[PDB]
Amino acid sequence: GIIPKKRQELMKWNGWGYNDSKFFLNKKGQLELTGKRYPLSGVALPTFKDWIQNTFGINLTPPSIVNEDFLHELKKTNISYSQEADDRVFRAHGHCLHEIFLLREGMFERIPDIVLWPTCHDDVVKIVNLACKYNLCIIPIGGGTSVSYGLMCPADETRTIISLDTSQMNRILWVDENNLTAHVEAGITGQELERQLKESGYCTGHEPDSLEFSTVGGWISTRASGMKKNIYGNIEDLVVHMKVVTPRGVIEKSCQGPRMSTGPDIHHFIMGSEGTLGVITEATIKIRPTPEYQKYGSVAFPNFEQGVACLREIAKQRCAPASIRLMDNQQFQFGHALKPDPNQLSVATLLFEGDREKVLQHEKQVYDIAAKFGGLAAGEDNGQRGYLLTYVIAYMRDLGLEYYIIGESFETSAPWDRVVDLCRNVKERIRRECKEKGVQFPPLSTCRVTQTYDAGACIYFYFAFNYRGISDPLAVFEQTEAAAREEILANGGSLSHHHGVGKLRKQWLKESISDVGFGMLKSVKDYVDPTNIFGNRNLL
Amino acid sequence: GIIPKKRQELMKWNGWGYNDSKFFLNKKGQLELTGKRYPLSGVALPTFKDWIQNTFGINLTPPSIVNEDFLHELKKTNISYSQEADDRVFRAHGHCLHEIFLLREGMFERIPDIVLWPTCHDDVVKIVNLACKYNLCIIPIGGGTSVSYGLMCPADETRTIISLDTSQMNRILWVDENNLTAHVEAGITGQELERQLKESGYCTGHEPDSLEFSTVGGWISTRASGMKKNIYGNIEDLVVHMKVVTPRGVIEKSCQGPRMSTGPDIHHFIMGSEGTLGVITEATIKIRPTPEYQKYGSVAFPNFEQGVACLREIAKQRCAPASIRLMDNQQFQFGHALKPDPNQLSVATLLFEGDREKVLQHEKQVYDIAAKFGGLAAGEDNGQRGYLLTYVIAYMRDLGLEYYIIGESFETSAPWDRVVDLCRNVKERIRRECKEKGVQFPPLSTCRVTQTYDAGACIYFYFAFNYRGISDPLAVFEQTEAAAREEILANGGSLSHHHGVGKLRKQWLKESISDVGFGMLKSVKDYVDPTNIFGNRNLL
Numbered sequence A, B: 001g002i003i004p005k006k007r008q009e010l011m012k013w014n015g016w017g018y019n020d021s022k023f024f025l026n027k028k029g030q031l032e033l034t035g036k037r038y039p040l041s042g043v044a045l046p047t048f049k050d051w052i053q054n055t056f057g058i059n060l061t062p063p064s065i066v067n068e069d070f071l072h073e074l075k076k077t078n079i080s081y082s083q084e085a086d087d088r089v090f091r092a093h094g095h096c097l098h099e100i101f102l103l104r105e106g107m108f109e110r111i112p113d114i115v116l117w118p119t120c121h122d123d124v125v126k127i128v129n130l131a132c133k134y135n136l137c138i139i140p141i142g143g144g145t146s147v148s149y150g151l152m153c154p155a156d157e158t159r160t161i162i163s164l165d166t167s168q169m170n171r172i173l174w175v176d177e178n179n180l181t182a183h184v185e186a187g188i189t190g191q192e193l194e195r196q197l198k199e200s201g202y203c204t205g206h207e208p209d210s211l212e213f214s215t216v217g218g219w220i221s222t223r224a225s226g227m228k229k230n231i232y233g234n235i236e237d238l239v240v241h242m243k244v245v246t247p248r249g250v251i252e253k254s255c256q257g258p259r260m261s262t263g264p265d266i267h268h269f270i271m272g273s274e275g276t277l278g279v280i281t282e283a284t285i286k287i288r289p290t291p292e293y294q295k296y297g298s299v300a301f302p303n304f305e306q307g308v309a310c311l312r313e314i315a316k317q318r319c320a321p322a323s324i325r326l327m328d329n330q331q332f333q334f335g336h337a338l339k340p341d342p343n344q345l346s347v348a349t350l351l352f353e354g355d356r357e358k359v360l361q362h363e364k365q366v367y368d369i370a371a372k373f374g375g376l377a378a379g380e381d382n383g384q385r386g387y388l389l390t391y392v393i394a395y396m397r398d399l400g401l402e403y404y405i406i407g408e409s410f411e412t413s414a415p416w417d418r419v420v421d422l423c424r425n426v427k428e429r430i431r432r433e434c435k436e437k438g439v440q441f442p443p444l445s446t447c448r449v450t451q452t453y454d455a456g457a458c459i460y461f462y463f464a465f466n467y468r469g470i471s472d473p474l475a476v477f478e479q480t481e482a483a484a485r486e487e488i489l490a491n492g493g494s495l496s497h498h499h500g501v502g503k504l505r506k507q508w509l510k511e512s513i514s515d516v517g518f519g520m521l522k523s524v525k526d527y528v529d530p531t532n533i534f535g536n537r538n539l540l
Ligand SMILES: Cc1cc2nc3c(=O)[nH]c(=O)nc-3n(C[C@H](O)[C@H](O)[C@H](O)COP(=O)(O)OP(=O)(O)OC[C@H]3O[C@@H](n4cnc5c(N)ncnc54)[C@H](O)[C@@H]3O)c2cc1C
Pocket: A016, A094, A095, A139, A140, A141, A142, A143, A144, A145, A146, A147, A150, A151, A166, A186, A187, A207, A208, A209, A210, A213, A214, A215, A216, A217, A218, A219, A220, A221, A222, A223, A224, A225, A226, A227, A274, A275, A276, A278, A279, A280, A281, A394, A498, A499, A500, A536, A538
């Protein structure tokens, strides 16, 4: 569960995930997943090949530029470091499509010059003090799962870029059973954090799809959201305290009290900072007893529209289960094609978790509400296989890439009264833009509602196309994604619910938060990091 | 429910509340409240006189300095304004003890020079533009309920001080029944907001003790907390959107989505700004159906310690009702003395509110948990009279002042494992400090736990003494309150849970949030308001 230093030894150098986990054609000509790692690993998927065919119409290094005096002082600290090509290349990207192409099919313009692996807070203080002295530039990395060009090195950056890798600064420091909090180093992965806490009968319940690699410090940096937010909260709810190293000095509140009125909350100044202000070294997170019991479920609806109305009503009654998600028809068919009126029909997956008794009180209320929108209980299996699926979806990018298929997921949050219109108009905008740019086959564009809130919902989109017969396929993707974002904003959706801005969405930020607001962010950046040491150039 | 312009016509010029509501000795020599306004209004309180005697051992204008050219432009806007003494004196204070003495028994050093009453957002833009041009200073006021010297005018402030009164900028702009949000002007009072919304079947549930006068813009400015937070949230939870006028310009997010990842959340840059960055003019707040049903309750415990352990356990199981509060023994006796082992015994009051059916499921779980800490159901009456009492407590300051008794309430939040020790040591610190400073009778110092959180609790303290026979009684109070704050911090409590900092707690802020953090606040202030127009000098 700890990420090793030489990452390529466990993980794919050119795509998502673990080296031992890849999609291949088995000795029956059926798609199957390698290894023994996930539930679907080593399980043949007879309909999955047919589905890809039917849906898409297919068959089936720069040198290191580092000062020798800085390197001399760095050796005195016994902070491990590397100037090796394959380590620096690994830490120069996340998992946006364009990055993955330049990885497979060429080279990046700029990559980090040196990688450092601090192991504690004081190490990070040393590195930042060194960067002041020798005029260095720092780009923190945890899991490297950014889908916002958050880790990309600016091409015109003349200074030595340090990739400050947090993966080895990863121990749970204390578990406070009295206050139900856990004080942890920022580099720890979700999976490792949940595994260690479970041994003591606890958990956080913070479960992003990237949890195998994404870190505590990452989550704080990007305002990450988790699958079971309904119970455990998002990251802004979960974080009681943090310790941050910046060029100006160390930020840290002097007390651990649950809720304060001591001016503007400086946690929110860091939470969402996307690596531009400093290094988040330590954080105190809320824990809960390991849930007594879990149960899955599903509900089918005549159409998407009625499903949304039901989710709305569940939100209105504040009786949403741990996870509730509504798939459109194309996604329902997708999930059916992965097992070992039926064209508009939509399905909601459910996950209830908690105390044995309360879980059932909940379950009833949800199904009764669903009844009144034409919702019919559609089985415990549908639910369960739906959630196990989520940690393998990311591997399908690489599969599609073999067979001339490209695509990416994208998201927004919007008010309840804009959901239905937004989903419909964004999908339409994708079809139109594709046709106009010369795509031969109708592009796949689907959506699901992944989170409910009082004031609205999170909407998660997939879009993909067969790019065979297109002059410049990356420009087509790039331009269509940007069109979808324009449509999202025009239909009252947000710039991002949880992926954040990074460098992918910088152009919209001033509109989103206003000019004065943008300037507030800049004023902070310029106090904390006047000479731009933390110069990934995300956000501003 | 709307605050009029000439406030003194409905409200007390020299103390808390409505003119028609005062404690007096009735024609039987019993204490009674005037008027018909509260549940206890016109109800005689036979034991209350005896209690005050037993507990305490007693028997029972500067000229307006304003530019004529600015005044000329102001007349062109038809924004109402006043230079009258009694209007300016009214808006020069909140309800800290020292302010109330200077009001009754003398004069303030500095007061506002002119009062303005804008009626909308554009009016506020005009005023702030005028303050840039003629070098004016602005101190926003809503209810004037600050207990942090938040409204006090700095004595050495040479510029013309505008009291920007929000009371007339108070209309509900829309009610969005689809998104369950209400878009409101910042000057509306809680009481008026709840009344208007109830006519459409809705509420916010945000219920501070100051709700009769405190405003939406106030609550955002001070990070206000409400009695029924457990259901409805505190202000940071309730606010979906806001519009803020600052010298640099207008801040406002371009979309109304429920949850975002677009960098640091600029709402939290304003929320807690205590009138130092700008004027909050409009805000979008979460609403809920008017709760179907309410029920009160109470539980008695052998001691305070066991009550705290029970509240902790309720928090751990996340089954706290709308309100749960634990009184120490002195406060239990107090409440008993106001009706028309018993020395350590403590009592918890309960308020359950919601859907008819779910309220009872809750009720059972609370009492069963309480059973295991020696908690015996202690009646529906105790509960009900406990909560009706909270809106009359504030009127007792003025009663005590007649009979040589002074005192103030103060608060903190602390982790669960520091609650019991903090309460005991803070009370002890108050007795010791009082004795050392020459107080005749040991003072009253009591506490109650008013809110529970995952990571800790809010603790609410009263302290008071008979000041007869003391040279300088305001210095004694001042110095003791500051000693209590020292003791709070030393026992792991926070600088404030909900009253905020203002100018009362400025000296501790840098410790509380760290020096870099303090600088982050200052960096924002300086960008947004470079010439200190918003110069109440709270916080920094
Ligand atoms: C397959 C997949 C699934 C995903 N699922 C989800 C999901 O369910 N929910 C969700 O919110 N997001 C998701 N994401 C997006 C991403 O995982 C999150 O934004 C996550 O918070 C990033 O974690 P990380 O540790 O990989 O950070 P990185 O990708 O390593 O870095 C992200 C940014 O934060 C900065 N940073 C990292 N560590 C620190 C630190 N210690 N101090 C200061 N700055 C730092 C970096 O400089 C960079 O700008 C997913 C991404 C992928 C590829």
